[PDB]
Structure 1
Amino acid sequence: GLTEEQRMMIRELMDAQMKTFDTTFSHFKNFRLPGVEAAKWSQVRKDLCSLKVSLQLRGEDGSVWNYKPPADSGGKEIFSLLPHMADMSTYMFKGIISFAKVISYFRDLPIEDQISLLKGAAFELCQLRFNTVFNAETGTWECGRLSYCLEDTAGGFQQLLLEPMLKFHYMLKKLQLHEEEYVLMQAISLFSPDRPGVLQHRVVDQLQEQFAITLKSYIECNRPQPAHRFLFLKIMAMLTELRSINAQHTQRLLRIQDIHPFATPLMQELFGISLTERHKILHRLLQEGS
């Protein structure tokens, strides 16, 4: 029940996702691992305690390495997983950049608007991809050999749900979205006309409307159950909440970087720590081939 222009849009996005989402994380290697002014710290310790995960590294041989993090005994021990987290995030950001590069509507845009769109949506598209590997029953992101498990708390669900990034994950997972709906959410978030720096506002706004129309038409053609009533509007509301979480995450990251520098060079360009001149890695990655 979709137009062939909508049908080609969906499969160009789904082919893009297949080519640029390493769902098994097989090509992620050479990552750092945990080893074997006063007012600021209180905020930073809060920002990092709400995201207390354990790491499981499985080997092709069948062996398993497990890392339980250090409990809060003050400081410098709260930054144990930060180097690894910056390596994984940079790897995901590169996959997001490659995702946008192979989409025709994105590469046909000015390189400065391509930089502005990727700076505003990198975190958001990374969360959408991570939701597809999130296990809500075990609170674990299953990333191939790497698994990230939320540490059990006495609060019990309620405490974790006070973290907005976690409740987004549990609520988006509850919608039980298809692959096509996640990749249309990625396109709608990527082609955001009101991101800082964007110049071709109308061009991007017109592109965003077509993606949103395609998603509404896809849902109408494949999800007629009462469980999926108002699903399109729920997804659009979820995307609005994701934009709010994105702004919070940028503020958290800048606060941690000020007291403990950890960001990779690509994260510094994406989070603001001649656009093309200030964003050389992004400029090089976007001129490179897919």
Structure 2
Amino acid sequence: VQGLTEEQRMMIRELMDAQMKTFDTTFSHFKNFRLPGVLAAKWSQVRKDLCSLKVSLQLRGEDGSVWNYKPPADSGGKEIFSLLPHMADMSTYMFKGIISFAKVISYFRDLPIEDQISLLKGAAFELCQLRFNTVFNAETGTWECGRLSYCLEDGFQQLLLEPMLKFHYMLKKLQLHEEEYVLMQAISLFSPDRPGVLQHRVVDQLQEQFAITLKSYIECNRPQPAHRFLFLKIMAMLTELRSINAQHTQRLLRIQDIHPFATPLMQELFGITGS
């Protein structure tokens, strides 16, 4: 790109290299996942917690066959948990790609292992949502995950009330480059204020370099009036994503409390000990 320092161009490359190596955009290796079965104040809030992300699910076979699953309606029972096992498998698959992404980046390997763990615990969800946005189809409200499709159930303005859905639509509208998505991932990963981080100074210095690189990238490759304040818009979305992360963590722990579903990797990322 233009106007970047050699160190910034190298920084952008290694992020792009790590994204290329660890983001299976066709989801070809997402396999052996569970699928929905065939044929007191907690519950009110878990009932409200689960209805926030209502999606149907399509599976296109290599032979051309199509399986499609329409979820039930909430009717006061355990049917609200039908996609929990499948969604756990997908998020687990994505978390593994995220962990692989961090471990390739030199700036991440060079951190102490305890801080590596702390940063991944704090940012794994956010980097997952950033990767899902690149396969989000805002015209059809569908995350195109290769042979899997997650379609939002029916208007458009009433769904933007859901913060994570609003995030995906608003982030998609910015029409970001691959380089800007991966820089967002690095900024979110290297957040110095996550619980348990010890090397706050180096992590803060690294994050600042990633933000400066992103600011510089935008200024060198986006002169259009539509991209005025784009960097600031991106940074605001990252703050919103952190809020959504905290929201979603409390959501998940409440559902986990009355209906266990978290995989071992999810338990590790969310602090669940097993006792």
- TM-score scaled by structure 2? 0.97
Instruction: Give the C-alpha shift of residue 2 in structure 1.
Output: 0.4
Counterparts of 1:251-266 in structure 2 under 5 Å? Answer: 251-266=250-265
* SS of residue matched to 1:147: strand
Taking the aligned partners of 1:122 and 1:214, their CA distance within structure 2 comes to: 22
Taking the aligned partners of 1:247 and 1:37, their CA distance within structure 2 comes to: 35
Over the aligned positions, Cα root-mean-square deviation in angstroms equals: 3.1
The worse-fitting range, judged by mean Cα deviation, of 33-42 and 204-213 is: 33-42
* SS of residue matched to 1:78: helix
* SS of residue matched to 1:101: helix
Structure 2: gaps of 5 or more residues = none
Instruction: Give the C-alpha shift of residue 247 in structure 1.
Output: 0.3
Residue 87 of structure 1 is matched in structure 2 by 89
Instruction: Give the C-alpha shift of residue 157 in structure 1.
Output: 1.6
Taking the aligned partners of 1:9 and 1:43, their CA distance within structure 2 comes to: 44
Instruction: Give the C-alpha shift of residue 31 in structure 1.
Output: 0.3
Deviations, residues 218-274 of structure 1 (Å, cap 9, x unaligned): 00011111110100000000000000000000000000001100000110111112x
Residue 16 of structure 2 is matched in structure 1 by 14
Select the residue among 46, 53, 58 that pairs with 1:51: 53
- TM-score scaled by structure 1? 0.92
Taking the aligned partners of 2:29 and 2:52, their CA distance within structure 1 comes to: 29
Instruction: Give the C-alpha shift of residue 148 in structure 1.
Output: 0.1
Structure 1: gaps of 5 or more residues = 274-288
Instruction: Give the C-alpha shift of residue 158 in structure 1.
Output: 2.4
Taking the aligned partners of 1:45 and 1:225, their CA distance within structure 2 comes to: 45
Taking the aligned partners of 1:7 and 1:163, their CA distance within structure 2 comes to: 37
Taking the aligned partners of 1:203 and 1:50, their CA distance within structure 2 comes to: 37
Instruction: Give the C-alpha shift of residue 191 in structure 1.
Output: 0.4
Residue 109 of structure 1 is matched in structure 2 by 111
Instruction: Give the C-alpha shift of residue 159 in structure 1.
Output: 2.1
Taking the aligned partners of 1:137 and 1:4, their CA distance within structure 2 comes to: 38
Taking the aligned partners of 1:140 and 1:94, their CA distance within structure 2 comes to: 22
The worse-fitting range, judged by mean Cα deviation, of 32-41 and 260-269 is: 32-41
Taking the aligned partners of 1:175 and 1:25, their CA distance within structure 2 comes to: 24
Instruction: Give the C-alpha shift of residue 50 in structure 1.
Output: 1.6
Residue 247 of structure 1 is matched in structure 2 by 246
Percent identity between the two aligned chains: 100
* SS of residue matched to 2:80: coil
Deviations, residues 154-183 of structure 1 (Å, cap 9, x unaligned): xx1222111100000000000000000000
Taking the aligned partners of 1:49 and 1:4, their CA distance within structure 2 comes to: 48
Residue 153 of structure 2 is matched in structure 1 by 151
Residue 39 of structure 1 is matched in structure 2 by 41
Between the two proteins, the alignment pairs up a number of residues equal to 272
* SS of residue matched to 1:148: strand
Taking the aligned partners of 1:17 and 1:75, their CA distance within structure 2 comes to: 41
Taking the aligned partners of 2:73 and 2:213, their CA distance within structure 1 comes to: 47
Instruction: Give the C-alpha shift of residue 95 in structure 1.
Output: 0.1
Taking the aligned partners of 2:158 and 2:42, their CA distance within structure 1 comes to: 23
Taking the aligned partners of 1:272 and 1:75, their CA distance within structure 2 comes to: 28
Taking the aligned partners of 1:212 and 1:75, their CA distance within structure 2 comes to: 46
Deviations, residues 32-65 of structure 1 (Å, cap 9, x unaligned): 0001191011111111112110000011111111
Taking the aligned partners of 2:134 and 2:62, their CA distance within structure 1 comes to: 23
* SS of residue matched to 2:76: coil
Deviations, residues 51-95 of structure 1 (Å, cap 9, x unaligned): 110000011111111000011111210000000000000000000
